[PDB]
């Protein structure tokens, strides 16, 4: 009744092998006493990185060490304890004069790859799942606190995006909006992990179209729709002119972080948003250079 092959076949194991278990580690490893040792067959120091493993040699087998009780905690080197720190990721400009944002409204695209500081850290991993808390600092180009009223409205991808300082879209009957005065403290907001994908993707090695991928369409390589959270709209609550030159700065902090695959840090200066393009005409060394490898 059974071909035996079907019985043996392990095909269908949703269970991953693992072979590596995560253990508790509040305090760094404590060093222990170590005396001299002179023998053959034992080569702690001798390794072969040609395998792809980080030398497992310990201090003890290298020098006559003493005993030390490492009380040094490793709680600040955790994900949350690291990423969970407010930082500039957005910045909108609603001036009185100019060509940038007239009319009194502004639709900002939801993307944080616009600022170094934050972008550097986050691009350390390949995937990342988490919630966040955004703070909104509204102010004039000088630091002047003005008695103006604004309305921040979130526009999910597929929702009607405001087209004017008085577009119908601002009724926000469904969308989430927030009204605040520049006199009141900044806006406090909590945002849940929203994405069709189980985790945000920093690097997308593929095309979202699935078409011909012509040259003129190479503008899509790297664009992942799972990171498209729609847009963010803001404007003054009025029918007339704003009367004031405003500038909103968006800050973000991450809560309940979950990073996965780790990759090399950034070596060059960022050029475009959501584009790992670098300064090819002038590349700089990862770090400082010397005059001779035999001189300090």
């Amino acid at each position: 009744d059974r071909v035996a092959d079907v019985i043996e076949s392990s095909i269908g194991d949703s269970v991953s092998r693992a072979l590596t278990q995560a253990l508790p580690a509040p305090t760094g490893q404590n060093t222990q006493v170590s005396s001299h040792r002179l023998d053959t067959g034992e080569v702690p120091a001798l390794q072969a990185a040609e395998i792809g493993a980080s030398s497992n040699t310990s201090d003890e087998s290298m020098i006559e060490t003493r005993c030390v009780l490492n009380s040094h905690s490793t709680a600040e080197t955790t994900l949350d304890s690291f990423f969970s720190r407010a930082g500039l990721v957005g910045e909108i400009d609603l001036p009185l004069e100019g060509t940038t944002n007239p009319n009194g409204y502004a639709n900002w695209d939801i993307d944080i790859t616009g600022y170094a500081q934050m972008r550097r850290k986050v691009e350390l991993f390949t995937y990342m799942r988490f919630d966040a808390e955004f703070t909104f600092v509204a102010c004039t180009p000088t630091g002047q606190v003005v008695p103006q009223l604004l309305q921040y409205m979130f526009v999910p991808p597929g929702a009607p995006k405001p087209e004017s300082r008085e577009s119908l879209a601002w009724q926000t009957a469904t969308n989430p909006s927030v009204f605040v005065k520049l006199t009141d403290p900044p806006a406090q907001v909590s945002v849940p992990f929203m994405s069709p994908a189980s985790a945000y993707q920093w690097f997308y090695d593929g095309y979202p179209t699935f078409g011909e991928h012509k040259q003129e369409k190479d503008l899509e390589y790297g664009a992942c729709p799972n990171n498209m959270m729609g847009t963010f709209s803001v404007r003054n609550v009025g029918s007339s002119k704003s009367k004031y030159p405003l500038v909103v700065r968006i800050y973000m902090r991450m809560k309940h972080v979950r990073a996965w695959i780790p990759r090399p840090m950034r070596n060059q200066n960022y050029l475009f948003k959501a584009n790992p393009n670098y300064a090819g005409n002038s590349i700089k060394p990862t770090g400082t250079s010397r005059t001779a490898i035999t001189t300090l």
């Binding site: 949703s14 092998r17 072969a48 792809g52 090695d205 695959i261 950034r266």
Partner: protein, 236 residues
Amino acid sequence: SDRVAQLTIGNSTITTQEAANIIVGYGEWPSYCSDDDATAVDKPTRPDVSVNRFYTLDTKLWEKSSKGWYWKFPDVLTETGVFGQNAQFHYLYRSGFCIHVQCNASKFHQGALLVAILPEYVIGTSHPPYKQTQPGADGFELQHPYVLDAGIPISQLTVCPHQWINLRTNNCATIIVPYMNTLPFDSALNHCNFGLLVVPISPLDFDQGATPVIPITITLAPMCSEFAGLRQAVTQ
């Protein structure tokens, strides 16, 4: 009993006499999809042996000046063997790989090749072409190996499933990687879960007289192959 080794999958077998052991990507073996991680409501196809086998594709020539090369797994294999078919006929794809980059030489030669894996390998340059992002067979070549053509330092690539082929010791590397993506399945026709990079950190050198033809071959094998969303045959 650590240098010699044999790999047997499908109807293919690999040999070695100077291997430096096997590395398992992030310490995890290729597993199938759980009945909760999947959303695709339809029993996929696990052809197994017909696709989960060793495929020797491209080969390159190492020189005292070579910069380096790279490939994009999901795409690379397509168009070849039974695997390619399922990848082109089906919409959803899922599988892990066993990579074996072999490159031998004599005890009078010297060189060091870094062979690492890099998930979601995106590249820069103001936008690279389809012939550069998905150079399936015969891969592509690195122009600025120091920044991996992405703006990131190669000196920090060891932070990923890697291994070295130091001619004075071993003559081949072997890596095993499980499916990697923020999703259960995904079409490999337009998305590559990761890529392979082979860069000479120690310039291949040898005194004149010794056979200067030092080839580097690439051989991979799918594992736990699962395909869903059966439809018309597609190419890209």
